[PDB]
């Protein structure tokens, strides 16, 4: 059985990946499952679960099981400060907010969660989490020293340090519900010098933005707000997934 | 040509590694080369260059070239705060002091050095740097929240988080010239749960301590003080290298 990381590396070697992020604290459990259902048929590759609204540990296990019961896609935990570790998920982004001003979001929370994670068979995927302007809630809670959306040099420094630290993915985060996404010149410049896949999330609502970011060099595209706030998830996500595969 | 990391992983799969650390700021350049010379014939596998005494960039290039001129061993930079990056070295431990109280030693200095390092063909080896009691100078300068030498749980948390972050090596550091080395129970407990090689340095002066730590599960042993402060380096290091290969 292929791991999620092997799956991503294979899918991104000559293609692009779309991922659907679902905030379990923003909707009831079976509403989350319906979103993941329609996301799967829109063509999404993985379901991400996480967000800013704080979670009940009893409630997140419900939403993950509801998603895995209605879909056959792998579910990856997109963790926050809440120690959102649950045994019912397939993988977890073991991430570090590299440009945070607080040790707790760079290494602190991850060290506390390490031993409990070692007791689970959940897959641990090392990922660098870079928060760009405007950052929204995650940039506020994470105490992020926000990278300007067009700052190629600062993004390159963090992305290169991520690769040299051994991280297998790097995530360019503009913040959930951000009006702007990360600049394409930043994605373009980093893709010239980096050997690990680049994931872009935050502010991607339209196929045109998803395609422009993929054409800029982004290997994976994450959409969260546009999937949780559309009354028909399929007709919102399907054109985004399609425009990404054109690249 | 094999990389240093591939070399270490091959040497540690069914054997142990000894490394000799040389402080370039503690001795003149050709005295450093003589130490590396006698260390090579004592049987050491790699030369490490670095330390606490602050370095002149002009002076460290001298010591590295002097070592590489007299020895055929690979030289790895053991960096401090000084941005000790030099083009004449074979590799650099791209390390993070995970238990530091300052962001600059966890991620700060490494982000600043990332782009200059990308312009060099020097090999970047991802390593987690864990500073144990008493820590000595590196624990003071690094603002380390010192891990007790027998604290299995705290060491396991940091070592596991290192592996889940993608680090390829973890370094148990007691401090240069420390009277005590890391407890063997800590090495023993971590070696049960970890998939990356464990390197132990600090306070290892005798073959008995080097052998006891290797028998405890340590994959690599670093000796610095005993090599720089012995008038005959060979007769000090040769029994240490031999007692390690018995394991
Ligand atoms: O909700 P959006 O704006 O699509 O962002 C997705 C993800 O990057 C937020 O954590
Ligand atoms: O000098 P010693 O005590 O051998 O320690 C080696 C290294 O761990 C110090 O940085």
Swiss-Prot record, chains A, B:
Q: Which GO terms describe its biological process?
A: glycerophospholipid biosynthetic process
Q: How does activity depend on pH?
A: Optimum pH is about 7.0. Active from pH 6 to 9.
Q: Which Gene3D superfamilies match?
A: FMN-linked oxidoreductases
**Which cofactor does this sequence's record say it needs?**
Mg(2+)
Query: How does its activity depend on thermal conditions?
Result: Optimum temperature is 55 degrees Celsius.
Q: Where does sn-glycerol 1-phosphate bind?
A: 171-177, 202-203, 224-225
Pathway stated in the Swiss-Prot or TrEMBL entry:
Membrane lipid metabolism; glycerophospholipid metabolism
Metal-binding keyword on record: yes
Describe how the cofactor binds: Cannot use Mn(2+) or Zn(2+).
Q: What is the main EC category here? A: transferase
What are the recorded GO MF terms, alphabetically? magnesium ion binding; phosphoglycerol geranylgeranyltransferase activity
The reply to whether Magnesium figures as a keyword in the UniProt entry is yes
The annotated subunit structure for this chain is: Homodimer.
Descriptive protein name: Geranylgeranylglyceryl phosphate synthase
